[PDB]
Design an enzyme around this catalytic site. Sequence first.
Site, mmCIF file in Angstrom:
data_model
loop_
_atom_site.group_PDB
_atom_site.id
_atom_site.type_symbol
_atom_site.label_atom_id
_atom_site.label_comp_id
_atom_site.label_asym_id
_atom_site.label_seq_id
_atom_site.Cartn_x
_atom_site.Cartn_y
_atom_site.Cartn_z
ATOM 1 N N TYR A 102 0.769 -1.254 0.000
ATOM 2 C CA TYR A 102 0.000 0.000 0.000
ATOM 3 C C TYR A 102 0.791 1.290 0.000
ATOM 4 O O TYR A 102 0.225 2.347 0.136
ATOM 5 C CB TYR A 102 -1.084 0.020 1.112
ATOM 6 C CG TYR A 102 -1.899 -1.242 1.048
ATOM 7 C CD1 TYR A 102 -2.804 -1.458 0.015
ATOM 8 C CD2 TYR A 102 -1.675 -2.270 1.979
ATOM 9 C CE1 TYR A 102 -3.530 -2.687 -0.065
ATOM 10 C CE2 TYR A 102 -2.339 -3.487 1.899
ATOM 11 C CZ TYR A 102 -3.268 -3.691 0.890
ATOM 12 O OH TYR A 102 -3.926 -4.902 0.842
ATOM 13 N N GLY A 145 4.009 17.852 19.509
ATOM 14 C CA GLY A 145 3.118 17.717 18.353
ATOM 15 C C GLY A 145 1.995 16.726 18.573
ATOM 16 O O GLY A 145 1.431 16.152 17.618
ATOM 17 N N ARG A 183 -3.057 17.803 22.323
ATOM 18 C CA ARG A 183 -4.105 18.688 21.914
ATOM 19 C C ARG A 183 -5.164 18.816 22.991
ATOM 20 O O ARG A 183 -5.273 17.946 23.860
ATOM 21 C CB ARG A 183 -4.700 18.160 20.639
ATOM 22 C CG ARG A 183 -5.345 19.191 19.871
ATOM 23 C CD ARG A 183 -5.606 18.769 18.431
ATOM 24 N NE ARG A 183 -6.441 19.766 17.841
ATOM 25 C CZ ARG A 183 -6.901 19.724 16.612
ATOM 26 N NH1 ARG A 183 -6.611 18.688 15.823
ATOM 27 N NH2 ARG A 183 -7.693 20.706 16.193
#
Lengths: 285, 284, 286, 286
Positions: B21, B137, B175
Amino acid sequence: VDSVYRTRSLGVAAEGIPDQYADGEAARVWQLYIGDTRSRTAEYKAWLLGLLRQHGCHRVLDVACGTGVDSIMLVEEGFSVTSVDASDKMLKYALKERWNRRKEPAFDKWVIEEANWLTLDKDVPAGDGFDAVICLGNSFAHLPDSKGDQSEHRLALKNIASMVRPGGLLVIDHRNYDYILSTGCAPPGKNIYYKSDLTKDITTSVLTVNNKAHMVTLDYTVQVPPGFSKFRLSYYPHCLASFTELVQEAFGGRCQHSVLGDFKPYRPGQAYVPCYFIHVLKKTG
Amino acid sequence: VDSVYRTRSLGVAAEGIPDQYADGEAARVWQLYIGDTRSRTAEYKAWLLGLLRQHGCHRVLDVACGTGVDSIMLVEEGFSVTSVDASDKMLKYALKERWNRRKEPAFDKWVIEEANWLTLDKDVPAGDGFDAVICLGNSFAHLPDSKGDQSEHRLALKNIASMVRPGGLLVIDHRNYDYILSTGCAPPGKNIYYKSDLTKDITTSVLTVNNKAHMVTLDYTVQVPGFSKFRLSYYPHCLASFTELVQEAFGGRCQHSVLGDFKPYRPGQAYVPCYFIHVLKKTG
Amino acid sequence: VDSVYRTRSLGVAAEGIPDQYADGEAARVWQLYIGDTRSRTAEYKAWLLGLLRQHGCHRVLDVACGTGVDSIMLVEEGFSVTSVDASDKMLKYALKERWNRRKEPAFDKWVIEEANWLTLDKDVPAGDGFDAVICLGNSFAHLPDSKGDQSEHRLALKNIASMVRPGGLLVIDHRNYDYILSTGCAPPGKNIYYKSDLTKDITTSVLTVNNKAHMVTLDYTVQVPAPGFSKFRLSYYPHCLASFTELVQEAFGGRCQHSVLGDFKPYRPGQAYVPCYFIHVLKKTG
Amino acid sequence: VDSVYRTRSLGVAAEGIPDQYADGEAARVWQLYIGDTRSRTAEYKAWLLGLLRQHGCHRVLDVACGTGVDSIMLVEEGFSVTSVDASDKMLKYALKERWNRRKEPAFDKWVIEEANWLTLDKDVPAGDGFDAVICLGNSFAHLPDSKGDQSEHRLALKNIASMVRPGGLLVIDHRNYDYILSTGCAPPGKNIYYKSDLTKDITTSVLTVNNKAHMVTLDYTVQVPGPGFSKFRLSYYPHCLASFTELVQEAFGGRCQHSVLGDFKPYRPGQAYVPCYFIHVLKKTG
Ligand SMILES: CN1c2c(nc(N)[nH]c2=O)NC[C@@H]1CNc1ccc(C(=O)N[C@@H](CCC(=O)O)C(=O)O)cc1
Ligand SMILES: CN1c2c(nc(N)[nH]c2=O)NC[C@@H]1CNc1ccc(C(=O)N[C@@H](CCC(=O)O)C(=O)O)cc1
Ligand SMILES: CN1c2c(nc(N)[nH]c2=O)NC[C@@H]1CNc1ccc(C(=O)N[C@@H](CCC(=O)O)C(=O)O)cc1
Ligand SMILES: CN1c2c(nc(N)[nH]c2=O)NC[C@@H]1CNc1ccc(C(=O)N[C@@H](CCC(=O)O)C(=O)O)cc1
C-alpha cells in the site's frame, strides 16, 4: 450494514507507533531470511568482479538494491555505485549500513535512492548511461503479471535496458523455474550468491491459469530459538526460452546475449541442472 | 471453504516492488500532510530554545522524531540530539535530511534510531540520562488504549520518564481534547508548532465506550485535480487525567507545570488553548 | 503484489458445505440471542391484541417478520397475516415454524415472503392497503444512515407508510435512544415484548460524527463451558424521540393522527417514568 | 493501531436488512447459475429412474439437496424422499418449492432438513437406513481438503455410506478432473443432468502444492446488457478416478460391489470417449 472501519488508512503511519504489521511474527522471520546474507560465496564474488573487470566497467547501477549486500561488495572494490529499489523497507538496511560506514570515503560516495523499474527512466536520469547494470538474486521475478499479457515485464525490462550505455553490460538473473514447474517443488538452501545459515522448510504452490503458469508461492517454515514460524512470498515463474526472448527485445535486438547456469557457461541438454540462469547482454556500441 | 490466499505475508517486502500500500491514494495524500512543516512558528522556536537554555540542557532525546522537524531545529541550534521513533516510514524522512546535510558537522553528530516507547529502556541506551526529553506535536495521543485500562499509556510514560537524568526535563504535549470532546469536532489549521499551508476538510468521529471516550478518528480530504482521503486516530487525553498520568510516570518525584499554547496556563483564564504542554523537572 | 484471492465469491454457496461464517462462534451465540423468545409478555399480547381489535383490523402486514414470533401470536389469534423481512437467515425460522404447524388451518394461510423496506412498493402487492402495518422489537433501528442525510430512513418509512390503507394503522417502535445517548450505556434484558431467559453482558459503543450521533454498537458477551465467554456484535441507528416523531409523520405527508406510547402506556412529555421503548401508533387519515 | 471495527459479527443477521453480501453482484449472477436447471436432460431422468426401479428403491436420501431439483423429480415419480444440505441458502429454494406445492400430498410428505456430511450420523435419524442415497451433480467435490490429508473426505464418505441400508445403493459422482487437470481447462456447458440455458465464459485456475493438485477455482463470466460483464467464483477439489474409486470403496470398508459409469453409460477403462462425469454406483453387501 456490512462495512468495516479502520483506525488508519492502509499505508499511513504516525509518530510513536509501529508501522502496519511491522512487528508481526511473519515479518519477524522474514527479517531473518533477508539478513541471511553473511556469507557471500567466493565464486559469486570472483565471477562478478571478473566479468566487470573483463569489460572495464567503473560506473555500476544496481536496480534491485534490497539490503545493499550485492552493492556493498562493489563499493568496497572501488566501483562508483548507484543502487535503487522500489521497497523502502528493504532499502532501510542498505541506508543504515552506508551510514555506519560513512567515514570510509567509498561509502560516502555510494548513492542509494528509491526507484521503480516501471518508472525508472524518470526516477533515475540515465545521462549517457551506466557501464554495468545488475539485477541479481532472482529479484526480477518478484514482479507479477497482474494485467495478464506480461506488459509490465516488458516495460520493466525496457527501462532497465535504457540504463545501459552503448557498449555496456546488463547482468540479470532468474531461478530455474523450468525445473520448479516440471517438479512442482522449489527446494531451500540453493542460493548460489550467499550461502544460507538459516534452516528453512519450503512448501511450493504453483498456480496455472487456463494451463499457463502464473504464480509460484513459497511458504517458509523457519526454526528459530526453541521455535517454528512461517512467512509467504510469491514469484513469477520465468522460463528460460521466454526470458531469453524478453530480455533481448528490451534492447531492440541491439545486443549480444549469452546465458550462464550458476556462473558457468550454459548449453542446452547439458547434464548439470543450474539453480539460476544469469543473462549477460552487451548493448551494441 | 471461506479462506483467502495472500500473495505475501502481512508486513513483508521484496526487491523491486513497492511495499504494501505504499503507493496507494491514501499514502500519497498522507505524505503531503506529514510534509506540511515548512513554516515553523517563531513562537514555538523561541519558547523551546528558552526553556532548554534556562535549564542548561545540552543532551536532548526526541522520543517522537517523525520526519525529524522538531529535532532538526535543535540540531541547527547547537544541541546534542538523539531522535527515535517507532515508525520506520516516518523516520525515513529524518534520515534523508541528515544524509543530505551530512557535510554539516552538526548533522554528522545527529543520532537517529528506531525505538518504541513500550520497550524504550531496552531500545535506547540512556547512559546517566538525558538533560531534556521532548515528545511534542501531540504524538503521544497516537498510542491507543488497546487493553482497556490505559496500562500501555502508563508503561510508555514510565519508560519516556526513565530517560530523564535526575534534575532534567520532560516536555510532552497533547491537543486540547477537553474542548474537542465537548464540541465533537477537531478543526484543521490549528497546529501551534508549524503553520499549515495545506487546505484540509476534516470529519471528526468520536467513539465512547460505556460512556468513557476511547478514540477520536479524523478523516481528512485534501486536493492533490483530485480530492483524496486518509484517516488517522488519536486517544483523547483530557487535561486532568494526563496531569495525573505524567506525574505518576515519575512516581510523583518531579515538579510539574502546564502551559497552554506556549504560555503559562492559569485555570479560570478566559483563553481556551489549542494544546497543553506539560513541563516536568525530575527530582535530583 | 498486495492481492488476496478467495476460494469463492462473497455471498455465494454450494451444496454440501455450510454458508459463509454460518458455523462461527459469534453466529452460534447470536442464534441463542434470536431464539430467546419463549416468553411473550402478557402485557404485550394484551396491548397489541386490544389495539388491533379496537380499530377492527383483520389484514395485517408485519414488515420486520424476523423469526416470526410477533406474526405468530397474530396468526394464532385469527388475523390474516402477511409477514415480510429483508433477511433470509431470519425468515428461515419463521418458515420452519409455519411448516411444523401447517396442519393448523391458520398457519396454512400465513404468507411469508422476502421484501426490503427500500423497495417495498415493488416487493409486496398491497392491494388497497392493510388494516395494520406492524414494525416492532426495535427493528427499524437496524437500518444505518449509510449516506448521511437519513435519506434511506425517509424512503423506508415512506414505503412502510404506503402499505397502510386509508383509516388504517402503522405501529412502529424504537428503543429509547435519548436515554442511551445520555448514559452511554444500553442495559441488558429490558425487552418488554419477550422476557429474556439468556443472561448477557453488554458493551455499548456510541459513535458521534461531527457531534451528531451516528451509531450504537453493542457487543454481547454470553457464558459458555474453566468456563468461557463468547461475544457477538450488532449495530443500531440511535433514533431519538423528537426526530422520529418528525420522520414518521413526514412519511404520511403529515396526513395522520400520531400518538406515542412508552412501554405500552401513554407517554406524556415531562412524565417521571422513563420508558425502555417508544411505540408510535399512527392512523392514516389520508 | 492496525485494528478494524465491524458493524456486525461475521454470519449474523438482523430484521429488516439484507444478509451479508446477499445483494452483491457476484451473488446476483451466481443466483442465475444455480437457477439454470429448468431443463433436466431426458437421458438423466431415464437413467436414474431406470437404475432405482431396477433395484426396487422406494425411500431415497438425497445428501446434496441444493435447490431440490434432483429430489423434486423423485418426489414427482412417487419415491419417499428425504433431502438434506449443509447450505441453508440453497435449501431455501427447495423449501420454497415444497411450500408452493404442499397441496399435492407427495410434496407434503417430502422431508427437507439441514445436515452436514461431516456430522451426518447425528443430523439424520438413520433407522436401518435408506434404499438409496444420491449425491449427484459433482457436489461432493465442493468439500476442500483443508487439513491436507483428505480426512474430511474420508469422514464425509463414511458418513454418507452409513445411510445406505444393508443391500441398498449409493450413487455419487464427480466431474472428470483427470481430464481437467491434464488440459488445465474446465469446459463450460457440459452438465449432463440439466442443460445450460445460460452462457458463461470460464477461467480455470489450478493450484498444485508440492506437485499435488489441491484446488480448481472456476471464474464464471456472464453477459449483461449495459453489454458489460460480471463474474463469480467457485472452487472444487479435483478428484481423480483411481483415487475416488478407492475412497468410495473404503467408505464401506470394501463390503460393497462397485461399478463406474461415464456419462450414464458403462465405463471401460481405456475407452476412446472421454466422459464429462464419472458416476460411481455401489451396492452395500449389507
Ligand atoms: C484460499 N486459498 C487456500 C489455499 N489452501 C488452503 N489450505 N486454504 C485456502 O484457503 N490455497 C488456495 C485458496 C484460494 N484459491 C485461489 C484460486 C485462484 C486464485 C487466483 O486467481 N490467483 C491469482 C490472481 C491473479 C491476478 O490477479 O494476477 C493469484 O495470484 O493467486 C486465487 C486463490
Ligand atoms: C547523549 N548520550 C550521552 C550520554 N552521556 C555521555 N557521556 N555521552 C553521550 O553521548 N548520556 C545520554 C546519552 C546516552 N547515549 C548513549 C549512546 C550510545 C551508547 C553506547 O552505544 N554504548 C556502548 C558503546 C558503543 C555501542 O554500543 O555501539 C557500550 O557498549 O556501552 C550509550 C549511551
Ligand atoms: C478498530 N477499532 C477498535 C476499537 N476498539 C478497540 N479496543 N480496538 C479496536 O481495534 N474501536 C474503534 C476502532 C476503529 N475506529 C473507527 C473510527 C471511526 C469509524 C467510523 O467511520 N465509523 C462509522 C462509519 C460511517 C458510515 O460509513 O456510515 C461506524 O459505523 O463505525 C469506525 C471505526
Ligand atoms: C472428442 N470426443 C468427445 C466428445 N465428448 C466428450 N464428452 N468426450 C469426448 O472424448 N465429443 C466429440 C468426441 C466423441 N468421441 C467419441 C469416441 C468414440 C465413440 C464411439 O463409441 N464410437 C463408435 C464408432 C467407432 C468407429 O467408427 O470407429 C464405437 O462404438 O466405437 C463416440 C464418440
